[PDB]
Design a protein around this ligand. Structure first.
Ligand SMILES: [Mg+2]
Ligand SMILES: [Mg+2]
Lengths: 427, 427
């Protein structure tokens, strides 16, 4: 009665702060170029009378402008009013014809869901804090006490041109990839391995996967060339890697390309390109194009919408994994809670954590622990992380200082290899 | 910190009470017989340290035994642990080969979802009470302040054989159906009308729909014969009723029958028979069998699972309505909250409310108000209803006294028309 009435006021959104940040990144290679020296993100803080909630999203300027515009319309709403919040996000894009934020490797996701996602995450953080429960409980309760991640391998230069080598140094052949994988697994203990391909000819990447299978027997392996192959090349790669990889991710482009490959491939095909929005589900399912969908709450519309995708997957007999872009602790907490409370999210989740400096983040240290290749589900109310305001300002200052305004792997590569082509497929 | 720790204990399920009840029903006709003088339900009370939550489900003996068995396994869990609660329900049915609870008109729904549903409802009631918020807020917030229902018409005898006529008296022809509809709409103000068919030859039921269209111009009309027609008869009926009905519900049997009818029918086809479980979605969608799905949280697995169905419907371009069986106030509150927070649940919901005595229920009076053909969304924490313990005992005593142990429209009809056949299709 009096509890329900204060709860109505305690749950009203008074203010939203959107803060761009930048953190050091290494020269990781991929199908469209090479990572720039800084990765960008947006940090969303929803502020109520006496509390706040956090979300995290992309850092490019077009996206920040979209977030700010949505945020102006969301103020005054309850953190429980996710239906109307989503409507305001859609409304705010009404006149937006106005880039991925993901290097141009994930171009067809719903903009409204991308814009909605971090508000939805911050709202659930706030719903947890208000009720004194964890976000994983909001999502049906954890079915596992930690969430397993994969070791995400890249070919890479030894350092950014002109600077000294980073602590990993180069990986340009099977031997370098194995050495990277050992360093990473020795630190984290991941129990699954993924290699980012579309960088060398398929024959060479097949060789790195085989070299990894030999060096890490019985550890599930994945290969992701981000649609750098023709259908025939993809069929050849899948033949070579029969019995050797857990799944082959986005070998060829489009639902149609994937479906033609899936017909011959013995391993399941996974995707975060051909299926990246609810609208993509009907045609993919009709064509039996993909067998595993990598969820990503940052572009599927937040934690609850990701659960919906998970249920659609269970209903239609598809499997579910998790996609990552370079990210910080708010995203890691949300990925973990989501995965802990999603029964059929059984494959290990991708993360870029090993690529990020151990001392760069925006959350108070100590809430996110690794153990045996997994993050232990945070135990306090909400996401279980708090905002480190000194560290936010620091990473915001890096943002200001580095002058990067959008992610651009392709332009950065072309500064050193002006002949480089990012078009796919390529082999 | 200290709030989060008491919340962990305050949310643990200490006890579950399952109580069967019976309330007076009228001799409504349908494709499989005639309603018995009492309708059965189960009332579920989940009890925690200092609070309780309510759900409501079917009253047949096989179902009660299933609920009790699940309940024994659920005790000790948090009300937030809906994932593990669902698992326990599935586990509990492990050795259950061991009737619909719905007259044998809805026979293929998932038993695990039927068993899960009322615990899930009671848990959300409890999650709302604990957090001081309405269930509709738990489900993303209301997008409407009241939920519209339909006037649900039946052919019926004037009273049960041997007793005096009830206040409606008989409806056995177009004129009786119109008079029933006027009485009902004068009392409730519903703005949509549904007739239960499969009782008279299709020609006669077409005549009642036309007579209703004339007497209530511009009021959306629906017809539900519960698959009493052949495909050819269904095509004929849909031709006759072109432009006259909002949708034609379950004219023919099975996904295949529905699909063949949908090919020629100009109105959309609705269903609560051919699609009543998540497993039914893939084949229905493949065959384009149905255009509208009537949700029913009592057999689709509770409020959150119904939202999932709603999202699947939005993704695949299907519309969503709501199915009813004879029910009490706990179910009405849950149907209302669910519908208020589901953006694409735009058709008016079915209800049997007008068929129930105005003074029979199990909730404290006054929380559920009608206005303009809709229920005003309850405003307090949880479902917004409380248990009337004197009235529960009263309706439980009726249960004990009336000796009915399962719903059986067909056996009851055959007491008076031993020649009657419940097989479908029939015309
Ligand atoms: Mg990928
Ligand atoms: Mg029906």
């Amino acid at each position: 009665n009096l509890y329900f009435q204060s709860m109505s006021q305690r749950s009203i959104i008074k203010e939203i702060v959107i803060t761009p940040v930048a953190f050091h990144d290494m020269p990781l290679l991929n199908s469209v170029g090479v990572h720039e020296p800084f990765a960008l993100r947006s940090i969303i803080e929803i502020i109520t009378e006496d509390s706040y909630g956090l979300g995290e999203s992309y850092g490019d300027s077009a996206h920040l402008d979209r977030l700010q515009k949505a945020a102006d319309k969301i103020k005054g709403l309850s953190v429980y009013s996710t239906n109307v919040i989503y409507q305001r996000c859609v409304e705010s894009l009404r006149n937006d014809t106005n880039g991925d934020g993901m290097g141009g490797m994930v171009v067809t996701a719903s903009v409204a869901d991308k814009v909605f996602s971090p508000f939805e995450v911050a709202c659930l953080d706030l719903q947890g804090k208000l009720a004194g429960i964890s976000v994983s409980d909001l999502l049906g309760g954890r079915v596992r006490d930690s969430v397993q991640y994969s070791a995400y391998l890249f070919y890479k230069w030894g350092g950014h041109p002109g600077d000294e080598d980073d602590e990993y140094g180069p990986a340009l052949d099977p031997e370098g990839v194995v050495k990277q994988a050992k360093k990473i697994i020795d630190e984290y203990g991941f129990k699954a391995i993924k290699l980012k391909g579309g960088v060398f000819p398929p024959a060479d990447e097949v060789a790195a996967i085989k070299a990894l299978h030999k060096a890490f027997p019985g550890v599930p392996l994945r290969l992701d060339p981000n649609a750098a192959w023709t259908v025939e090349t993809s069929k050849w790669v899948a033949k070579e890697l029969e019995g050797i990889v857990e799944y082959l991710e986005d070998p060829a482009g489009e639902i149609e390309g994937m479906a033609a490959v899936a017909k011959e491939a013995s391993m399941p095909l996974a995707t975060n390109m051909a299926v990246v929005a609810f609208d993509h589900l009907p045609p993919s399912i009709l064509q039996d194009a993909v067998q595993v969908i990598l969820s990503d709450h940052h572009f599927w519309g937040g934690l609850r919408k990701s659960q919906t995708l998970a249920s659609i997957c269970a209903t239609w007999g598809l499997r579910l994994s998790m996609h990552s872009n370079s990210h910080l602790g708010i995203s890691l907490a949300a990925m973990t809670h989501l995965a802990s409370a999603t029964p059929n999210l059984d494959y290990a989740c991708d993360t870029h954590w090993p690529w990020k400096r151990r001392d760069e983040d925006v959350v108070i240290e100590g809430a996110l622990k690794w153990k045996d290749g997994g993050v232990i589900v945070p135990s306090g109310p909400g996401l279980g992380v708090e905002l480190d305001r000194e560290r936010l300002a620091k990473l915001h200052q890096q943002y200001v200082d580095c002058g990067l305004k959008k992610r651009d792997d392709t332009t950065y590569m072309k500064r050193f290899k002006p002949e480089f082509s990012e078009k796919i497929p390529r082999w």
